[PDB]
Amino acid sequence: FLKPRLVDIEQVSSTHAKVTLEPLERGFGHTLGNALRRILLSSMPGCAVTEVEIDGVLHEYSTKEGVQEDILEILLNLKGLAVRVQGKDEVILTLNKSGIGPVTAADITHDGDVEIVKPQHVICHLTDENASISMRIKVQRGRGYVPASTRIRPIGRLLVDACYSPVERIAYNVEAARVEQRTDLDKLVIEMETNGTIDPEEAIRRAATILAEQLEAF
Amino acid sequence: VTEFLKPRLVDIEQVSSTHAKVTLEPLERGFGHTLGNALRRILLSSMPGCAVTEVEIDGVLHEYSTKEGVQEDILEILLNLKGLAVRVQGKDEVILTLNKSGIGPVTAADITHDGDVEIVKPQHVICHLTDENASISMRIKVQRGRGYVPASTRRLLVDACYSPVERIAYNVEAARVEQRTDLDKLVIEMETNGTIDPEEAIRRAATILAEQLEAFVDL
Amino acid sequence: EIKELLKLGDLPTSGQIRLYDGRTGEQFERPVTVGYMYMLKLNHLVDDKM
Amino acid sequence: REEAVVWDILDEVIREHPVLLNRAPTLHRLGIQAFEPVLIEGKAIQLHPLV
Amino acid sequence: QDVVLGLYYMTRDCVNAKGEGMVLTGPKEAERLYRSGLASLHARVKVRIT
Amino acid sequence: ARVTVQDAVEKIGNRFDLVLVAARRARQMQVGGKDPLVPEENDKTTVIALREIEEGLINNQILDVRERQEQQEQEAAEL
Amino acid sequence: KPLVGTGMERAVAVDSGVTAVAKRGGVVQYVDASRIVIKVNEDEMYPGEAGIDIYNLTKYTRSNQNTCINQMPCVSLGEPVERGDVLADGPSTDLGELALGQNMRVAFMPWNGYNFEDSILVSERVVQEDRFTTIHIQELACVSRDTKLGPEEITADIPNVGEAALSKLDESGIVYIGAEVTGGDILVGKVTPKDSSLRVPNGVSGTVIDVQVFTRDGVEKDKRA
């Protein structure tokens, strides 16, 4: 029984990559690929915005004079955000912007251990010469999907549903490997598509660790 | 964030021997299917074991033939030989002999013992002979392998049931922890051919899967 | 026209594609229909009827 | 107030206490049948596909 | 309408198979053979049954 | 611990007298301090009454004779 | 937008009245989340009383069926618009095109009986993306009649009820705008001469976004009003 090994990592794009597992015994390819796909899609840790505190907004069903979107759309845009904080498990960001122009993700005055992987992600549009917004973005780690109406105070906090799942599409593939004199040795190619806030090798290693921990029961 | 609900084998209650039904709970949401499918796929097609591969009957040279004094046909003899569960030591493959003469059923206890090679179910019948002058003698070939190798893949050809398991079928149903809504409760039902225990085969497959996932485990 | 428009991309002309099961990870042994249908949401919500 | 133990008491009053599920047009006598309840999270009464 | 379709697709034979002429030694072995992807669900075999 | 009661119906064959007999037994086991003759398995009184019917050591005649011997013992207990 | 349509969505969207269609073509001088300003071209201006035209969008308000009608802009700043074109889509519209639902990636197959008779099996990505999560603005009234023994007051103090339930209310008995009020809380504290305060119905969440107080003449006011 030969053991698989990470032999190749193709970072073909900024987000989606292609790891390669080789060699695999005949039949083990599909088993490991499906188990890793299920675990990666289900249980990978990530960071997403949880609470937003805009200064002049009391509830997420109002509007602010100067922005081009309702506060609900801004909350949806912040829900669609990516970040890869390193040491902390809960960080409060901030955003101050004035004048006409789109408010991208680059305008967040990120701290040292905050890495916005897509600075050009547009959040909202300001259509006034002198109209400033001040949102106190809160980011924390987690796992899976935790909606707002299920977790666990002031009337200035806007709760945002979070999706702590860096992965977006996992597709594996089993095919014959390049061994010198042998057949029935599979080569697994797990093509994953994250949002950039996780390293593919780290994701595969963590999925394997979770599977081994689960099988430690017997 | 990395805290996961660790399952424990709540009960390993077993039906009559080689029919144990394992049930562990509570699994994380979706992990029941993952564990069950992985264990089933490993136990079904990749397990070490020993089984009869080919048998050369002294008087039979064609699969569609009949020997006088034998109430069965050759196909039923091959089916009986396939169900012959055997256990072999470090020797990779050996040959047993089945000389028999006289009226009476031919069970698995009437085979050449060959020393270390042991039959786990000697009461398993093979042939019935209806004539005193009728005799049967064959040189069965038992080989050690991994999985299921049908005769269509490869001097009579017998399908090789290398895997010690006989029927594995998991079943995942919802179970609740004291506060969380939806979890999984893996219920594994396993039958073997007697050469190995079911609870032993489950941990054997778990070890096989765990050793595969050690090159890239965070430890 | 539908089949020609499907062939304009890289989709099968028959409309049906191969789907793999999400849990067992093995192929459904028949090509199944996959496409984009426009789903509504009628306001016969369960919470207004329970 | 729905404390943490009322659910642990509801599981004891409902263990083997059947309920009658009746559809609106009760044409024949099989339109009213009795089932042993199983508590689920949601708001929809699950019904066995055979009946 | 769905159990009927399942049992009609399961209990039906076509004249070809992944493995057709093979002879099986029990329903449990038939399930093991099918779930392993070694023989199609619509084979034409001779299983020994009790 | 109970799905269908066909065997208990076989024990007392009316399927309507069974309901009344089980009701009397379960009411004796619930309001009265009487104890089950079979080991209860965290079940309700009705299931235990039906199970005692299916175990064979209860019916209308048995319930009546038990109640009557208890009544005569109670009458004698006044002294 | 519906991927497969009929081309009648344009007429239904424009000629319904829920979307703000431009009256005279021009250029968007100032686009806001609740206001659109059109600088009409000089050929479309009258000699007297020319100026410009202002479109006041209709923000979150209650419909007859307790749904939400909310016009939102579809044009960008400094974008040349022509006469009779959509400037802001109403409820369930996309660039002046009637869009009543979402394009779901369906697959016709039996799946373990969870779509047995006519049921649907919806993936969790659909609820993660909030594609079908809708808003339901509903109004709750608390009238104050003057029955026998005297009229009724709207004070924030309620007998036999602690301050935990009265935390959300202000000093005048009316809940603050923006409260995350759930089922069973207090919205308006109304007392009956010897409690009949308005409470949110059972099992319904919410977020107060409007409080309007109508006081009959003769009563001066309450400070919240």
**Token duo for residue G189:** 């504290």
CATH number at residue B150: 2.170.120.12
Instruction: Read off the amino acid at residue F3.
Output: V
Contacts of F56 (CB under 8 A, 6+ apart): F11
Chain A residues whose beta carbon lies within 8 Å of the beta carbon of residue C26? 30
**Token duo for residue G47:** 């000699």
Chain A residues whose beta carbon lies within 8 Å of the beta carbon of residue G59? 62-63, 70
**Token duo for residue B126:** 């093979």
The reply to whether G133-219 shares the fold of G18-92 is yes
Q: Would you say A50 and A139 are in contact if contact means Cβ atoms under 8 Å apart?
A: yes
The alpha carbons of chain A give a radius of gyration, in whole angstroms, of: 21
Q: Would you say B25 and B125 are in contact if contact means Cβ atoms under 8 Å apart?
A: no
Q: Count Cβ atoms below 10 Å from residue C24 Cβ, excluding itself.
A: 16
Burial classification of residue A147, based on how many CB atoms lie within 10 Å of its CB (0-12 exposed, 13-18 middle, 19 or more buried): middle
Deposited experimental method: cryo-EM
Q: Would you say G75 and G28 are in contact if contact means Cβ atoms under 8 Å apart?
A: yes
**Domain span holding position B108:** 48-161
Angle at A119 between CA A115 and CA A125, to 5 degrees: 135
Touching B: which chains, 3+ CB pairs < 8 A?
A: A, C, D, E
**Do the chains contact at C38 and G3, CB–CB below 8 Å?**
yes
Chain G nearest CA to D1, separation (Å): 9
C20 at the G interface (CB within 8 A)?
no
CATH number of G18-92: 2.40.50.100
Q: Residue G92 to residues A180, B103, G13, G19: CA-CA distances in angstroms?
A: 62, 87, 9, 10
Chain E residues whose beta carbon lies within 8 Å of the beta carbon of residue G113? 2-3
Sheet holding B93-97, edge to edge: B93-97, B138-146, B48-57, B156-157
- N residues, chain A: 218
Instruction: Read off the amino acid at residue D43.
Output: K
B157 vs B123: CA distance, rounded Å: 24
H helices within G25-128, ranges in order? Answer: 124-128
Chain D nearest CA to B174, separation (Å): 10
Q: Which residue has the tokens 């649907």?
A: G120
Q: Residue A159 to residues A45, A47, E29, G124: CA-CA distances in angstroms?
A: 20, 15, 55, 20
Which residues sit opposite D1 in a β-bridge?
none
**Do the chains contact at C47 and D43, CB–CB below 8 Å?**
yes
Contacts of G92 (CB under 8 A, 6+ apart): G98, G99, G100
Q: Residue A72: which region, alpha, beta or left (left: phi > 0; alpha: psi -120 to 50)?
A: alpha
Taking CA–CA distances from C29, the nearest residue in chain E reads: E40
Q: Residue F77 to residues B18, F28, F68, F69, F74: CA-CA distances in angstroms?
A: 60, 20, 14, 12, 5
Packing angle, helices A200-215 and B31-45, rounded to 10: 80
Q: Which of B71, B56, B139, B61 is nearest to B99 (CA)?
A: B139
Angle at F4 between CA E50 and CA F10, to 5 degrees: 85
Residue B81's SS3 state is: helix
A9 at the B interface (CB within 8 A)?
no
Chain C nearest CA to E23, separation (Å): 23
B152 at the E interface (CB within 8 A)?
yes
Beta strands in chain G, from DSSP E residues, in sequence order: 20-21, 26-32, 35-40, 53-56, 61-62, 68-69, 72-73, 80-81, 86-89, 102-108, 186-188, 198-199
Contacts of A216 (CB under 8 A, 6+ apart): B6, B210
Instruction: Read off the amino acid at residue A94.
Output: T
G112 vs G119: CA distance, rounded Å: 12
**Token duo for residue F4:** 């269908």
Chain D nearest CA to C34, separation (Å): 26
- N residues, chain D: 51
C6 vs G178: CA distance, rounded Å: 50
G102 at the C interface (CB within 8 A)?
yes
A21 vs A177: CA distance, rounded Å: 10
Chain C residues whose beta carbon lies within 8 Å of the beta carbon of residue D44? 46, 50
Q: Would you say A67 and A74 are in contact if contact means Cβ atoms under 8 Å apart?
A: yes
The alpha carbons of chain F give a radius of gyration, in whole angstroms, of: 13
G105 at the C interface (CB within 8 A)?
yes
C23 at the A interface (CB within 8 A)?
yes
Resolution (A): 3.7
Q: Would you say B28 and B172 are in contact if contact means Cβ atoms under 8 Å apart?
A: no
Helix H or strand E segment including B63:
none
D41 at the B interface (CB within 8 A)?
yes
G29 at the C interface (CB within 8 A)?
no
Touch A-C: 3+ C-beta pairs under 8 A: yes
Q: Residue B130 to residues B56, B73, B93, B110: CA-CA distances in angstroms?
A: 22, 13, 33, 17
E16 vs A1: CA distance, rounded Å: 35
Q: Count Cβ atoms below 10 Å from residue B173 Cβ, excluding itself.
A: 11
**Do the chains contact at G107 and C32, CB–CB below 8 Å?**
yes
B85 vs B100: CA distance, rounded Å: 20
Q: Count Cβ atoms below 10 Å from residue A52 Cβ, excluding itself.
A: 23
Q: Residue B179: which region, alpha, beta or left (left: phi > 0; alpha: psi -120 to 50)?
A: alpha
Contacts of A65 (CB under 8 A, 6+ apart): A128, A131, G32, G33, G34
Q: Which of A51, A58, A122, A145 to mutate to test the interface with G (most CBs of G within 10 A)?
A: A58
Touch C-F: 3+ C-beta pairs under 8 A: no
Q: Would you say A167 and A44 are in contact if contact means Cβ atoms under 8 Å apart?
A: yes
Q: Report DSSP state, residue E25.
A: S
E44 at the B interface (CB within 8 A)?
no
Size of interface B-C (CB pairs under 8 A): 5
Note the Cα C47 to chain centre separation in Å. 28
B211 at the A interface (CB within 8 A)?
yes
Sheet holding G86-89, edge to edge: G20-21, G86-89, G72-73
Q: Residue F4: which region, alpha, beta or left (left: phi > 0; alpha: psi -120 to 50)?
A: beta
Q: Would you say A67 and A84 are in contact if contact means Cβ atoms under 8 Å apart?
A: no
Q: Would you say B171 and B4 are in contact if contact means Cβ atoms under 8 Å apart?
A: no
Taking CA–CA distances from D44, the nearest residue in chain C reads: C46
Number of domains in chain F: 1
Task: Spell out the CATH class of G133-219.
Answer: mainly beta
Q: Would you say G77 and A127 are in contact if contact means Cβ atoms under 8 Å apart?
A: yes
Chain G residues whose beta carbon lies within 8 Å of the beta carbon of residue A127? 30-32, 77
C27 at the G interface (CB within 8 A)?
no
